[PDB]
Amino acid sequence: PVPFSHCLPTEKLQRCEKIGEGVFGEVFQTIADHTPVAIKIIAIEGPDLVNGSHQKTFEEILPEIIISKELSLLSGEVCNRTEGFIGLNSVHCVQGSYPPLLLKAWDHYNSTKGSANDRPDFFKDDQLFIVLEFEFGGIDLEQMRTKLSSLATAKSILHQLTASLAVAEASLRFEHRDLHWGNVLLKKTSLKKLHYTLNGKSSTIPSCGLQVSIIDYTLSRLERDGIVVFCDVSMDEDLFTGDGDYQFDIYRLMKKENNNRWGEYHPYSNVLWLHYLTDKMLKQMTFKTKCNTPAMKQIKRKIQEFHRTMLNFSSATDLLCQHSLFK
Ligand SMILES: Nc1ncnc2c1ccn2[C@@H]1O[C@H](CO)[C@@H](O)[C@H]1O
């Protein structure tokens, strides 16, 4: 292991601002070489509860590391190519107490947005962490609830998500398994069209000025050459007992689909998450401009039709290739 200063030299540490959190740990934004990055910091291997939960072991965090690398690499592949995941810049194992400068950033977020986490100030100098440095992907869909232009933008977002998932199905037999709206990031792009390649066939998606990135592979599954990497939640109690959001039904519906066998490949889980996201677009997102052109009112009807038909498709690949929304 390395000190925090290896990943976060002084200027980079000084520029850290907290941008997100979960039970897992903390997410900061910083800048180096004029380019923003997101730094995800996860405590591992220790005996303390953190945010009310036990810390993962190194063996338990390896799947996320592996999957983050494989999905990042899809941006540079040929037959199955997409930029719709997030870039992975580096992964380090760090040892030390939490940097005071990160505690300062943590406090500022707590003061302004509020935190559900413990202040991470109780770690000793032998504590291990995994520090994942990603591309900065933009702002999550949940925080953009009231910020998008119109349902035209929603269509682009759903198309981008579907295409990315299809490319990952095709290359990696990938299932995200936790694609809630905090895990869909939106960044401005000057590109009018985005490009992907699925089993050697290239196509484009009108961007509506945004590039989508799918993040957070903590529950994800994939395989290469018959070796499966996944999170076995078969004995998890709490994952399947949520309520108050369709999100929590998706965990139950995944478990029904896979008979509680999480190592198997069930790409229908990607369709379930896409349905949950379409449902958010129609029910919880609110747009600056409502549909008032015949072209826009047709777009709304088409997204409604997607919502009521998409659960009859077997995978994100099937949706992309066969659904009328994308023709
Ligand atoms: N690579 C990234 N680029 C930008 N923001 C990121 C990431 C990764 C995570 N986040 C933000 O932190 C929240 C919790 O994962 C997410 O919901 C999200 O707000």
Question: DSSP secondary structure string, 285-296?
Answer: ---SS---SHHH
**Which sequence spans correspond to the domains of the chain?**
1-136, 137-327
169 φ/ψ angles, rounded to the nearest 5 degrees: -55, -45
Binding residue numbers for ATP = 19-27, 40, 135-140, 178-183, 216-218
Which uninterrupted H or E stretch holds 36?
strand 35-44
Could you give phi then psi for residue 66, rounded to 5 degrees? Answer: -60, -50
* Residue 235: Cβ within 10 Å count: 7
φ and ψ of 160, to 5 deg: -60, -45
Token readout for 15 is: 């520029």
| Best CA proximity match to 26, nearest among 81, 112, 99, 124 | 99
Q: Ligand 1, residues 215, 218, 280: which to mutate, most atoms within 8 A of Cβ?
A: 215
Residue 153, helix vs strand vs coil: helix
Rounded to an integer, what distance in angstroms lies between the CA atom of residue 241 and that of residue 237? 7
- Give the C-alpha separation, 279 to 23, whole Å: 25
Within 6 A (CB) of ligand 1 lie 19-20, 22, 27, 38, 40, 86, 134-137, 140, 182, 185, 215-216
- The minimum-distance atom of ligand 1 relative to the CA of 20 is 12
The separation between CA 60 and the C-alpha centre of its own chain, rounded to angstroms, equals: 18
Q: Which ligand 1 atom is the nearest neighbour of the CA of 142?
A: 17
> 1-136 has which CATH code?
3.30.200.20
Strand pairing category for 139-140 and 227-229: unpaired
Three-state DSSP class for residue 301: helix
Going by C-beta distance under 8 Å and a sequence separation of 6 or more, which residues neighbour residue 46? 55, 123, 127, 128
Cα(197) to ligand 1 centroid in Å equals: 26
Taking the centre of ligand 1 as the mean of its atom positions, its distance from the CA of residue 249, in whole angstroms, is: 23
| Secondary structure class of 190 (helix, strand, coil) | coil
Element (H, E) at 33: none
Give 3-state DSSP helix, strand, coil % of the chain, rounded to 5: 40, 25, 40
CA distance 212 to 277: 13
Residue 140 CA, closest ligand 1 atom number: 19
Distance from the alpha carbon of residue 84 to the mean position of ligand 1, in angstroms: 14
Solving technique: X-ray
Beta bridge partners of 85: none
Q: Which atom of ligand 1 is nearest to the CA of 86?
A: 1
Q: Nearest Cα to 37, choosing from 88, 76, 82, 3?
A: 88
What CA dihedral angle connects 253, 255, 256 and 260, to 10 degrees? 180
* Residue 14 burial (CB count, 10 A): 12
HSE-CB of 74 using CA atoms within 13 angstroms: 30
Q: Which of 151, 111, 112 minimizes the C-alpha distance to 286?
A: 151
- Kindly report the protein residue whose alpha carbon is nearest to atom 7 of ligand 1: 38
What is the Å distance from ligand 1's center to 36 Cα? 12
Residues 6+ apart with CB under 8 A from 21: 27, 109, 115, 116, 117
Are 63 and 231 in contact by the 8 Å Cβ rule? The answer is yes
CATH architecture, domain defined by 137-327: Orthogonal Bundle (1.10)
Q: Resolution in angstroms for this experimental structure?
A: 1.5
What is the rounded CA–CA span in Å between residue 72 and residue 88? 6
Q: CA separation (Å) from 155 to 1, 133, 278, 318, 326?
A: 45, 30, 9, 17, 9
Hey, do 1-136 and 137-327 end up sharing a CATH topology, with the first three levels equal? no
Question: Is the Cα dihedral 246, 167, 87, 4 positive or negative?
Answer: positive
Distance between CA 135 and CA 35 in Å, rounded?
Answer: 9
Please provide the size of the chain in residues: 327
**Per residue, what are the HEC states of 79-125?**
CCECCCCCCEEEEEEEECCCCHHHHHHHHHHHHHCCCCCCCCCCCCC
Largest Cα–Cα separation, the chain:
63
* 173 conformational bin, left if phi > 0, alpha if psi -120 to 50, beta if neither: left
38 CB-near residues (< 8 Å, 6+ apart):
19, 27, 28, 29, 133, 134, 135, 136, 137
Q: Which residues contact 271 (CB under 8 A, 6 or more apart)?
A: 310, 311, 313, 314, 315, 316, 318, 319
Ligand 1: residue of 19, 35, 40, 71 to mutate (most ligand atoms within 8 A of CB) is 19
Contact between 141 and 157 (Cβ < 8 Å): yes
| DSSP letter assigned to residue 323 | -
Gap between the Cα atoms of 263 and 200, Å rounded? 27
Which residues are designated catalytic?
178
- What is the distance between the alpha carbons of residues 146 and 187, in angstroms, rounded to a whole number? 15
CA neighbor of 93 nearest in space, from 50, 131, 134: 131
193 burial level (CB within 10 Å; 0-12, 13-18, 19+): exposed
Residue 252 contacts by C-beta under 8 Å, 6 or more apart in sequence? 240
How many angstroms is it from 39 CA to the middle of ligand 1? 9
